[PDB]
A paper describes a structure:
3’,5’-cyclic uridine monophosphate (cUMP) and 3’,5’-cyclic cytidine monophosphate (cCMP) have been established as bacterial second messengers in the phage defense system, named pyrimidine cyclase system for anti-phage resistance (Pycsar). Until 2021, scientists reported that a group of bacterial nucleotide cyclases, which utilize UTP, and CTP to synthesize cUMP and cCMP, defend against bacteriophage infection, proving that cUMP, and cCMP are authentic second messengers controlling anti-phage defense in prokaryotes. This anti-phage system, termed pyrimidine cyclase system for antiphage resistance (Pycsar), contains a pyrimidine cyclase PycC and a receptor protein with either transmembrane domain (PycTM) or Toll/interleukin-1 receptor domain (PycTIR). In this study, we aimed to structurally, and functionally characterize both cUMP- and cCMP-synthesizing PycC and cUMP receptor PycTIR.
The structure of PsPycTIRCNBD–cUMP, solved in the I4 space group, contains two continuous polypeptides from residue 1–150 and the C-terminal His6-tag, which can assemble into a dimer, similar to the known cAMP receptor protein (CRP). Binding of cUMP stabilizes the ligand-binding pocket, promoting the formation of an additional short α4 helix. cUMP also causes a large structural movement of the C-terminal stem helix toward the ligand-binding pocket, producing dimerization of PsPycTIRCNBD. The dimerization of PsPycTIRCNBD is mediated through hydrophobic interactions, including residues Y128, K129, I131, A132, L135, A136, and L139. Specific recognition of cUMP by PsPycTIR is dictated by the N143 sidechain that forms two hydrogen bonds with the N3 and O4 atoms and the S98 residue that forms one hydrogen bond with the O2 atom of the uracil base. Furthermore, the sidechain of R138 forms extensive cation–π stacking interactions with the uracil base of the bound cUMP. The cUMP ribose 2’-OH hydrogen-bonded to the side and main chains of E87 and G86, respectively, and is located at the α4 helix, whereas the 3’,5’-phosphodiester linkage is recognized by A89, R97, and S98. Changing the cUMP recognition residues, R138 and N143, to alanine or serine, rendered PsPycTIR insensitive to the presence of activating signal cUMP, supporting their roles for dictating cUMP binding. The cUMP-bound PsPycTIRCNBD dimers pack adjacently to form continuous linear filaments.
Residue numbers in the entry:
A (entry chain A), B (entry chain B): 1 to 158
Amino acid sequence: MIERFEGETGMRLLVEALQMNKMVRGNVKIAQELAKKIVLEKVSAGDELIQQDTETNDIYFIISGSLSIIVNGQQIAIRGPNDHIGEMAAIQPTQKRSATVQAVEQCLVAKITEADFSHLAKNNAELYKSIAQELARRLQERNKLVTTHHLEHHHHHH
Amino acid sequence: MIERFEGETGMRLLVEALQMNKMVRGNVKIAQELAKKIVLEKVSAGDELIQQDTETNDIYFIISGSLSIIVNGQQIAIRGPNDHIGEMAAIQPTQKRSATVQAVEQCLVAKITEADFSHLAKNNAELYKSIAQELARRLQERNKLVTTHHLEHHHHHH
Ligand SMILES: O=c1ccn([C@@H]2O[C@@H]3COP(=O)(O)O[C@H]3[C@H]2O)c(=O)[nH]1
């Protein structure tokens, strides 16, 4: 789908794409500035765009496809069109990637570096706000009960 | 407690407890302005500062004491001094309280209205960034609980 979004002719639909992103929420100003600063990447199915406990700090705006969020071997969510990933490392200068993010399928993403993002968010506070809202949602979702497994051990030494 | 932080005499100790807040991160200008627009309240052991599915939207900076965070009858966290509460209902303005907040002992909290907080934060990007950062930290701790395998061992030796 890249070719639709590439170049000056692609900009009309690149800006609208980024307007639909949950972190942008329709703001043309942020979308236009974001459009100037992102780089388009395709992601192969099964690719780990982000790996847990690595020290990348890029943010990805998901235009197309979907990705597994995996912590310590277990999937805890999936993220699809108009979602974002990598914001947690981008707003915390000393935190490693909290999760592996793996393409369930072929995806198209807009990548922005921490340096370009922090410079934009500096004077577009509402990006920090909209990130907070997303993190609030992830926090408020399906707490359920963490199971304790009970084991009885009969130990024999040789 | 409240005596220490009230009036001109108290302002030095009030600003100091405020600039120590997880949301203020040592910034003096923000602490000084916060102080100008908070009301100190004593919260008593047992008193529900905030009730789940209620529609208050004040933010509280915890200066002294600690409080239970409760979702549908059962606790999920404790917030101590330098924490805050009610920050989500000043980030999602159309949303009821997500949790009850019951004081575990006598507390001194600083209450600011949504109106005053929003006005302050609007020209002070860092408050929204600070909120995002603490929500990211809390989601990290949750990723860890949810994906940690919890095991209860009973060992018999022969
Ligand atoms: O409950 C959730 C839902 C989504 N995520 C994402 O995993 C990403 C991993 O890298 P990061 O730490 O820079 O950013 C993270 C988030 O975007 C998560 O960690 N937990």
